[PDB]
């Protein structure tokens, strides 16, 4: 049949040709795109003779320009943006913006001048600027792929990629401008019109993209368990944004799509992870299809109607143009180098050379050249444009793309560093050992004894891809420093893999560690981490001001005046009435429409009059005290004036202003929520990085004790770590005090994340045991994922709980309502000011302190520490009745719940059960004492501190009421720690001190009925 | 600009409307498709008045029929096929084929008769058959989703889905036929032409799809580390198959796409797993887009130009038609029920009612109705077709789709079974316990003490979604039987999750277990498992015959006559020459072409003459003995006759036949490989299921010893398990003997799979420790995945290794070339026939037997067992010098390497090192003895037998040369087992027997220097 969609044949053929090209030239240096161009040229030449191939090709090869752009360019641009590492892009944004915007301007201008002066085509400035804009387009994929693969200068890869993104967007903008100037020349517009056009293309585009992106992520964050909807929304958002911006609004669509991609890639937390991984490959595949189609269309067109108008001088011009554009890009990079060196990551001459050589052209330039070809028609301009663009693309893909690897080798950037080589060698050796063990296991299997082991061993073998004095003191200290940095990086990776750290915090910590590792005796100084948790003053200032604006404490039928429905109704009334207020006056700027709209205006005036009467008769004389109500009264005044009544054009403005401005009262709270959200993001990263650093320091300080030899260097390293940890904890406490609600929200979020992660772990564990079918386990996992996604929509400003809630949430006051009542009755609330001492070292343990507000410093004896809300001081005091262990000083205004030692003795005596109160207290103290010991003995193994704390949580405290000697049964036992008192090994009668871990070899423990030091011992069990 | 692609707006709008519909009506019973139809109707009515909306809609709403089909129908059909559970579909294929093909025929015929007689439209039979074909289309999604969710009658879900797939395909075929009969009426064709047309649509379609699918999977199985290529190949294959089949070949494209989807979904092992999971969602999303677009187009068209021609009687006809089609489907199901009950899964009346009520119509029927609308144009036929189709779709989506849940409730199918409720309750309780533990852990954290715990606890809470006598003896035996079945299912799931079982074997075992669990005292009888490993005689017969054909033992310049290049060259010559032999004669059926082709024919005759002279002068008088060479000589005879010369038309056939038939010699070996592949698949499933059953029986036989009480029922269960295991092992050994090479290939494949799985596990383990960066670990994982995918392309017929290789691959002869030489010198090869006894019980241990071929039965004293190739007999004999433990009887012709006890004593004495030969022997024996003990004590925990064997592999044998008493240090120790001799606990002097596991409580062991029973003890260590 004649009306078959022949485009399908061409599309699928391009797919298969791309498959063949990639498969065959996977290992060769020449990229597959050149093969696609050659195949397209062959296809075009054969079509020129065979009419059937012409029938199958014409539909796509001679496609309309607008179709080409509005289908392919959004795909290419959004795939480029959605592939970005947005965070390093933003941290190098100024550098990339300079290098991209100003670099494109200069390069395109110089290329246009070259085209006008060198070429004999006698082009005008508009056509030459079009040419330069096309030539300035860039394609980083083949170079950034290598830079990401080699791992050298990870910053350079993203600088190149983002520069390509931005220069491609701006090049498309410039191309559209000059294309409209040359092929659709309108009348010479006024300078004001040109300024408006500039604002419309350069400013309105990003704002349109930003609005669409924020709306898109808003909806995405409220879709649960519907992947198809999320993917469909993303796709439709991209295409609809481009179409609406470029056509309806005449706004720059490419920039809008760039902003949309960046914003969604940043807010990517709003997207379910599985559809995120789906979307990455989906957009990669769409971009691949677009690239293949564009290259094959270029081949067809260039062989059909471009080379026919090519002369000998054109080749010389092509060579000169290639050299010229290379030199121009190099000159631009070197010229801005003085500026870029002082901004962001800076530039080395090696990085600059890679940037200069790696500037490949690609699909964007070819698409624009095809547009020029279609628009020019019979004119030679299109032929020359397509010829030169394709020639330079071919040259870059043949010379630059193939020689970039050799250049990276020559400049010394491709060298794998020694640490990576050592890590790979160790991993390969461990893999070989595991494979040998598995082979030995299999050879013993009766059902596999006859298997050909030579073939198996050959098949499963994995190979290494990379295959007392000052000098001595300096060597030893460098060794210790590098080893500590490696241990810290390992700790951060372990923290992340178990879900305790977000990716951003891990990346910050790791990159800081690496930077410190290549700068003399530079450890990870806290000052660099400081910038993570430093809140810019703009957000706190805005919060303070805006919250002042909505402070109704001057004010706080009457029942309705303070009921929600009233405000909701009037808000809806204003928002609805705004639509007529726009439509009517724009229509005036048909009488049966105006009169009806003015009747509706009477109706809305009646609604406002009813509302004003409501407020007056409810709030009495207090109504007009509020400035908001003053504005409302002025609204009613204007309404009376203009309903009783230059008057017309006066009314058209007054009834717009007085009515549109009334919704700012409802707007401001949402703006406060936005400010809270940004502060929450910054504070969340601050907490993540600070806590990660503290935990890593704690783990490494006990790792190094067994892996660094000299005592003095060990002490120096410990001192450095302790100083950093103390500073970090103090800063985090002060931040908590500055913004209570945000800190509470962050901590609740972290708690929920941890609980849900461990719940998913339990689900997986009991699925592996086969106790749940895959489908039911999947259902439970779906519930977990839905809860986790709803977590992202937390209020972000949870009000701080009152002291009573903190008292009733203490670990050893969980449940047990009667004990909570007793303690709340006995407790007293004490307030202290800055610099005061709550309690001193050596004092008698007169009671507990539960910090309900503030921050305290704990000095002792080198024992400096900081405590904040929730922490309770003096448990050891009341339990063992020994003197105070530390001096408590307030670093800020502090409020503490004080419970006397006598009230604690009374509570302990009065409350007794299997979950004994004293049992709970000693359990908490014993876990806190035990965790450091278990890490000190076993931090060299893969256990994190979280694993140790959960391991102890599974344990129990030995009673010694049913016995007076403890047997290491090793069934229902995994490890033992002593806390209080002294014990003796039954057989050898060796002595164990109070805080000592029980050695593995020890068999049985003997105790004494010494009430003064009634021994307490902790045990953990396997099953 | 005017030439903007307005289709983009409509597509993206349909996307957003679908998103809104799904989001809003997620919980309501009404499906979102009805909402989409209503929205499309609103859009059409508003378009009829607003011309701009008409401009934006016309491009899609009034789309060409061919575009509609060739874009959407392939997507819908391939998504339906690629979503299939192909294996249960194939195991119910006959039932589905009856119910679908004959059911569609009857239903469509009856619907057409109803249309002709009831409706006043005065339709002819062609139009009525079109109507019936449209009405017969089905959409199971909303019902199969529930059946898969509830888990009741999993077979019913796939029966419905496959019936829908096949009936939709056949309905499209019938619609195409009658559409061509009515709207493109050609001249009345002859009956032979009709038969050819039937073969072309019904037969050639499936074959075209099969060929394309096999080629596609062939290419997919040779693409490594390129996801984009795989996805692009799949997409292009689907569309190109449909286009080529329907247009170029005029072959049924829908059936071709159905076969393509099924074959790819079956050969899905050829696809990289990540792109498999990508592709499932990709095709689901494409189908979703197609559905949304079709529904919105229906709304627009029906509101614009269909309802305008609707009358009151049409609604009555619609109601009558709905009732009629429902009754017809029910009648068809009940009428075929006698046949379907005796085929496959059968049918209950409840399942039949669900099938009758769940037959929803959908996108396919609407698309065909739109085709009829576009083709009919101004005729009322299109209006009536679209009206009735849309009305019935709406009615089914409103009545059937909403009431199917209530019907499943009424029929008692929605009830969750008690075991699932218990499993869910236990999982929820464990999750609550884990969350409470995590909460206790967090509350102790100093940095989270101030978090609002009420909010967290409320957020993280997961809730249960489902919220001595004959009578007593029968209850107890049922309890034990059900408990054993549950344990077996758990064992199968554990085996699968650790990668020891393929999914198919697990599903077979689990479904067999469930079937046995609901049928009186029916355990898992081996007879059901037998059909898994039973090879159909067709493949062995074909292998034997074809391998006989290529037996060149009559035959096996001369150097070239037996060199590969010769045969390769002549094969290429024939395949190349066939192309001219086709082109020239078809062109005859321009003279400058024929003469050149005949010169080329002379050239190829010269090549054949050179080849024949080659064979003659090389092979001498032996040349003509081979029948293949007789045919070759006859080829040369015909070539001479027709080159020297009715003659023309004689030549046109003779030079085709004699030349095309010569390539069968090269074809046959590949066909033998195909036969080997199918036998390999069947044998691989047989081994998987048999070994899984054996392992599950071994684990459950030791689980039950601690969880079933009465001794007699325990003995009965043990006897049943032992009988099943013995039969399974015997059958597997016999299968191995029948097909040696295939068994060797399967076992090598399993070994490589296990090794690579454990290597990936090690990579993940050391990544979690942070010892490798994510990128390098990803590189190693990529290498592992590439090796695993290449594993799928194994030869499948690895030749059996010779006895020397088996001797040099024994576990304790690994490496150590000198010992291998000694043993190969000392060893002797003995041959035994059926029924002979190699050695008897109580005999003196005179030497080892290594089975190099055959199968042996080991009787002893109730000790019946079977051993096969690779297994070695008599190790205990030579080590402990005790009498023979069992009687060895040959169940088939057996060959054994015999090494005398004296040679073993000499080898032991002569060879001594840290990896001592006696140490190796005792290590093997100790592991074999120890594994049962560790399972017997700890099979109740989550450990599988593989975990136990690896756990022992990490261990070592205690020397007792540096000491005579063993200390349970519990560091560098995890468990202890005794093997030989007797030991005593140092403190209590309690006695430990030779095979006993050392108790956890025991402290230290004391031994004796009794050489007669020199004690051997095994130890495993943690770190």
Residue numbers in the entry:
A (entry chain B), B (entry chain A): 71 to 537, 570 to 658, 671 to 703, 725 to 780, 796 to 1011, 1031 to 1192
From the paper:
One example is the sperm-specific SLC9C1 that belongs to the SLC9 superfamily of cation/proton antiporters, known as Na+/H+ exchangers (NHEs), which are essential for the regulation of intracellular pH, sodium homeostasis and cell volume. The transport domain (TD) is accompanied by a voltage-sensing domain (VSD) and a cyclic-nucleotide binding domain (CNBD), which are regulatory units usually found in voltage-gated cyclic-nucleotide-modulated ion channels, also referred to as CNBD ion channels. In a recent patch-clamp fluorimetry study, the functional integrity of the domains was confirmed for SLC9C1 from the sea urchin Strongylocentrotus purpuratus, termed SpSLC9C1, identifying it as a Na+/H+ exchanger that is activated strictly by hyperpolarization and modulated by cyclic nucleotides (cNMPs). Specifically, SpSLC9C1 adapted to mediate cellular alkalization in sperm only in response to chemoattractant-induced hyperpolarization.
In contrast, all membrane-embedded domains were better resolved when reconstituted into nanodiscs, yielding a map at 3.2 Å that was used for subsequent model building. SpSLC9C1 adopts an inward-facing conformation, similar to the majority of eukaryotic NHE structures, with the residues of the binding site accessible from the cytoplasm forming a negatively charged cavity. The voltage-sensing helix S4 is in the inactive upward position, as no activating hyperpolarizing conditions can be established in detergent or nanodiscs. All positively charged residues reside within the membrane and R1 (R803), which is homologous to R368 in Shaker Kv and is supposed to cross the entire membrane electric field upon activation, is still high above the gating charge transfer centre (GCTC). Prominent examples are the clear densities corresponding to two lipids embedded in the cavity found at the extracellular half of the dimer interface of the TD. Further, they form a cytoplasmic dimer interface and interprotomer interactions, with helices CH1 and CH2 of one protomer wedged between the helix pair CH8’–CH9’ and the CNBD of the adjacent protomer. Further, we could identify a network of salt bridges between CH4 and the core domain of the TD (E606–H157, R609–D155, K224–E616), which might contribute to locking the transporter in the inward conformation. Another interesting position is K939 on CH9, which is coordinated by E300, and backbone carbonyl groups located in the dimer domain. Under non-activating conditions, the TD is locked in an inward-facing state through interactions with coupling helices (state 1).
